[PDB]
Amino acid sequence: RCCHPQCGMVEEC
């Protein structure tokens, strides 16, 4: 879902 550190990315995409 989120692929950028800012939207809370936990695991890489």
Partner 1 sequence: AEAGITGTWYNQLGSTFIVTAGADGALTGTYESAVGNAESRYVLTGRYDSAPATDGSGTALGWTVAWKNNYRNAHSATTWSGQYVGGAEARINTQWLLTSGTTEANAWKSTLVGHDTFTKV
Binding site for partner 1 (CB under 8 A): 1-2, 4-10, 12
Minimal distance, residue 5 CB to partner 1, in Å: 5
Strands (E), the chain: none
- Taking the complex as a whole, the smallest distance from the CB of residue 13 to partner 1 amounts, in Å, to 11
Cα 3 to Cα 1: distance, rounded to the nearest angstrom: 6
String of DSSP letters for the chain: ---SGGGT--S--
Q: To the nearest whole angstrom, how small is the minimum distance from the Cβ of residue 11 to partner 1?
A: 8
